[PDB]
């Protein structure tokens, strides 16, 4: 008796449940559809899907007609559209969360145990005929071969949207606060229990670590002075676990919230900027509240930095990534009149989707000097040698690589993609086409439709045998990009829901928290409301360099 | 300089914040008022409070005109009113939670660390002139004296609403799943991390314990047979820590989710009933899903019992307690059109308010036998000696004591009340009158108004010196009771918000979870929708005894 749920019979978010020895039933509750397979639409459902323009057409609208968008951005329409974007995208993410690596069904354990990443679609049942369900071959393509053939960079392909390394390192720094897969527990488990923008990559993911990083004076974080500049303290002064190669003296190791940030100067650079910002805010708070103790100063500054982070991510980071002419806006009040849960649980699919390694260049240019990967990775003196401004200027000027399209991952880090594919099979992620449907898109009917070309498509078809066997991550990276864009429609249609839900799902965005008193008053509240990448850097450096998520002109 | 917030200047939920060396500012955001102290109403705010009838009047309407209610209860008006009750009561509880014993302000730590109970009103600042703020004497009345004088029972006072011991033990059993103050960490901390109806008192508050309790076959819980009846297993078979007097061997201990249930036959009675219900549901589930494994059977049965619990608590437990002619209803769908957060955090005030020791009798009667506290407490054989049916019958027949009114706590357990008062001072809970205002009532202007009499009021005035110095717990237990009611209005006006938010705030009540598939299909969903105290007992016992939360007529 072949498990009927292996055919993914239930459509439009209907839930497949096994009944008896060989039957199945689809729970169509609130899907907007009825029938054995949740395929019979109600009137409003049918109209909505019949009138909704394609993701590609909407993408076109949002990236053309600057004159019209400028006009619209200056009106209430900006708010109307931002609210629509927030609600429509977020609603595709279940909240409270549903499944995890252990339970392909709702359970109290999945709801309460936050050491688990959640998941949007249940796993491919273990008893299915093929690894992907019922389609494809008995054995999936070799992960290594797949990576060498379709993901390995031949010649660097710059991002057409002008994205730079300042952006690339921000993305890596930012995402590493909520993606922290546990080596000890295995795939499907995380150590970032905050499951969102808690800034645990600055303050630590646990209390004792936070306490080791804190000065416990004026609400500040410990630090050290080098060349008259402020930097994170060494592991000697802040006895915290850091992942550095054996053989590196403790005095040369910097201690920050995230244990892996010693890996790249680009990561430690952001750790330095944010640490400086935290202490700068502590100073502003104390001037306003001389009676406050160290604890309240520390806690309030953290809330302010969380807000500054979400503000910058929405209005500058996502703005650069989307390429939209619509001026995005971070305003929690846009959701006060809607039904929305202020909670977030990080999905394993979101983790996979965010492996944007193609962004990394062939080498790292700092002024007239060109640094190789061996001169960059784990280099513990470069940040201090050049200082914050110099590195920000260089990273802001160097272009990052295009993410989608294929063949654009530097050989130095290709092994990461190989492991992502291997872990996807351990997590038993459903095929790319099933995720397409889950996020409102039609499944691809062939590999040529996916790639937009013929040679790679033919080889993929040979390897996978069926488009319905194509895996999640490979599909995301091999999909044809939007015209002159950094990646394809799926990265946007699937990634936007996860990202936006994770930003606005934060408790500081709730009516209960979003008030001036939460941030120590008007001064703190305005810091959040007017935060900018430029101010983040320049209010914390001697001089102000070129700073942006876009390469200069 | 005297801390200005010691005067509780900000009204209507405005937040008091210290500015400069001696100033304060009230954050009136979304309170519906403006002005230095949030006292100037907006037009709609003024209308709402002017047309709003008093709690006493509303109570009258709900306990009179049975003929009218009988009509209402059979129409959709029942739903309209239940939704109104749910939303208006729940809106008084902040969500996400705000403060805790360490932070009298919003912070990421308060939001994320669930080992802390939350609190609704901040503590009395440690630097205030008097223990309660600015009113009263420099020293509060001795806790032991206060208890002896006003809380000690002199003559048993039965509850005029007919509440029985079956109800009392349900209340004790039920609340002990979310009130588990940590002896190690101290006041302000809890071990019940589920913060609500997770049934941790049946399955254990931690995974390791749950695993020792589970059979790992058919999704069931371990059990043992005695006199042909099913009971919880022994600690020898289920190696779990249970709090029993030293000298009682593991083979003679019963292992259940909550460590302290061996203390009373009444507690183990419910532990036994729910254990039998769990395994019963597993049988029903397996019949429907023969392909399911032990894990899914166990998790699904747990979800069903959670739903059954909420159903019985709202429609029978709270119904009995309220004495309303309005037929309360548990229907999550009532809130699907409203803005509501599906989460809960247990408040320290809710813990205090739920110390209903007056309910306990002078002795426990089982048929012709009358057992004393010395014979009842920690009795290791009574449950098995009599069996479930006999104890349910006896407890359903014996009257429980009136909660409010004062002087009704049996001397055997008066020490608990003494400790509650002492814990209250450690927690630095604000005065009863501040809580009255926080929950929408006018503060009492004198002790005579509070008690409704002259004798106790006169002595209370002498001891406290000022009505605004009266503490939270004593205030709840000494306030005059509603006509022929089990307690006063404050217990209802303050208790209803916490209780209802805790019941509906459960994730199973969310649109995401409230579906047939969550409970294994229609059979499981109906078990929840039709749950009853009588069925809970009789579908798990040989014979059907008198079972109710009210003594027989
Ligand atoms: C979140 O969710 C994750 C995933 O579930 C949790 O992972 C960890 O917790 C699990 C439970 O502790 C770990 O499971 C392992 O199970 C092994 C097998 O043990 C079996 O259970 C008992 C063992 O007890 C037996 O009897 C006596 C009684 O006193 C006992 O002393 C003795 O040890 C004896 O074995 C028994 O019925 C069986 O025969 C088995 O022994 C354990 O050996 C192992 O130590 C562990 O407990 C799981 O491995 C943990 N780690 C991971 C990554 O899975 C995580 O804890 C959850 N987080 C939270 C906060 O809840
Ligand atoms: C939820 O919230 C509660 C309440 O905060 C929290 O409670 C528990 O956690 C804290 C922090 O771990 C415990 O702290 C206690 O106090 C001291 C900490 O003082 C330190 O001071 C010195 C600094 O240490 C230096 O750093 C070196 C690093 O290598 C170290 O080796 C040396 O010690 C060195 O001196 C030091 O002198 C001292 O030893 C301490 O490190 C602890 O020692 C003490 O044992 C306590 O842990 C709280 O007590 C603890 N429990 C309570 C009830 O407060 C929970 O953990 C939070 N829960 C979660 C999930 O976050
Ligand atoms: C835990 O609970 C169990 C019950 O489940 C306790 O055991 C029971 O104890 C009672 C009294 O201690 C035993 O009483 C039985 O019936 C009569 C009762 O007394 C009669 O009524 C009054 C009281 O004196 C008098 O007017 C009458 O003349 C008459 O004495 C008693 O006399 C019998 O001898 C008989 O024991 C009951 O039998 C017993 N049940 C069992 C199965 O043991 C147990 O003690 C308790 N543990 C603790 C620590 O107290
Ligand atoms: C960690 O990062 C540090 C950067 O802060 C590294 O250091 C710097 O390393 C560079 C490269 O080795 C070093 O370069 C000096 O010498 C260069 C001479 O080479 C010239 O440029 C071209 C390269 O061959 C030729 O075309 C040209 O003819 C000439 O030969 C010169 O270009 C540089 O400007 C510079 O003078 C820097 O001096 C180092 N700076 C410091 C502060 O020491 C360090 O090596 C990294 N650590 C590790 C282990 O890799
Ligand atoms: C020089 C650049 C660079 C290097 C050496 C690099 C290295 C790694 C290594 C090593 C791993 C872990 C792999 C394993 O197999 O266990 C990993 C994981 C990961 N990395 Mn990348 N990474 C980037 C850039 C780099 N990453 C950029 C740019 C981003 C974009 C946001 C990114 C995002 C991720 C994500 C997301 C993970 C997964 C983290 C987790 O699950 O713990 N990264
Ligand atoms: C026979 C009767 C009986 C006994 C011996 C009993 C005893 C105790 C003891 C001892 C403590 C812990 C006190 C301390 O000072 O630390 C405690 C706590 C508590 N009890 Mn009563 N208790 C009841 C009945 C009893 N309780 C009933 C009935 C209820 C009503 C719902 C109730 C509710 C509470 C609550 C609530 C707590 C606090 C739990 C927590 O903070 O851990 N109960
Ligand atoms: C609903 O989904 C099932 C499962 O894929 C579809 O397939 C079933 O019905 C077909 C129609 O006769 C049979 O030919 C298939 O063998 C059978 N497969 C299984 C797994 O039972 C079914 O057609 C779908 N029905 C609708 C109305 O869409
Ligand atoms: C706001 O609340 C405060 C505190 O209850 C009120 O009290 C302050 O002002 C009074 C007016 O003269 C003084 O008599 C009090 O001593 C003073 N107390 C403090 C906190 O310093 C104040 O009157 C209220 N103001 C308004 C506009 O209602
Ligand atoms: C109501 C007015 C409609 C005008 C039709 C606009 C046509 C836009 O056409 C768009 O062109 C893009 C490429 O440039 C494609 O990628 C989109 O899928 C396609 O819809
Ligand atoms: C209310 C929001 C409306 C957004 C619609 C903006 C879409 C911009 O549409 C633009 O209109 C121009 C007309 O001169 C065309 O020339 C451009 O090709 C087209 O992209
Ligand atoms: C013309 C400008 C319109 C701006 C509104 C865009 C926001 C709607 O975004 C929509 O969200 C859906 C669910 O996530 C997706 O399935 C659609 O493809 C996407 O276009
Ligand atoms: C038509 C609407 C008329 C509204 C009349 C406003 C009445 C509320 O009046 C307010 O009462 C408070 C407490 O007594 C005072 O502290 C405020 O200063 C006062 O403005
Ligand atoms: C009885 C008349 C009641 C009128 C209700 C007042 C509505 C709120 O009116 C507001 O008052 C503010 C203070 O000047 C202005 O700044 C706002 O623009 C205005 O909308
Ligand atoms: C829609 C909800 C309506 C609630 C109103 C219920 C109030 C019951 O009101 C009752 O009406 C009786 C009339 O015969 C009087 O005799 C009772 O004294 C009075 O309490
Ligand atoms: C006549 C029937 C009326 C049913 C509506 C009752 C529900 C409203 O309940 C109200 O909740 C408020 C907030 O907790 C309290 O302050 C009010 O005193 C209370 O009556
Ligand atoms: C605003 C816009 C949209 O909703 O279309 C949009 C586009 C892309 C993202 C996005 C952000 C991070 C990873 C992947 C996708 C996003 F979060 C929002
Ligand atoms: C339905 C009614 C109301 O809201 O008035 C009501 C009355 C009393 C309670 C209540 C339940 C447990 C402890 C304290 C109060 C409750 F939860 C609900």
PDB file of C-alpha atoms in Angstrom, chain B residues 50 56 146 262 324:
ATOM      1  CA  UNK B  50     -20.098  57.333  30.841  1.00  0.00           C
ATOM      2  CA  UNK B  56     -22.256  45.350  40.283  1.00  0.00           C
ATOM      3  CA  UNK B 146      -3.225  39.667  59.925  1.00  0.00           C
ATOM      4  CA  UNK B 262       1.011  12.683  46.044  1.00  0.00           C
ATOM      5  CA  UNK B 324     -24.420  33.539  35.447  1.00  0.00           C
TER       6      UNK B 324
END
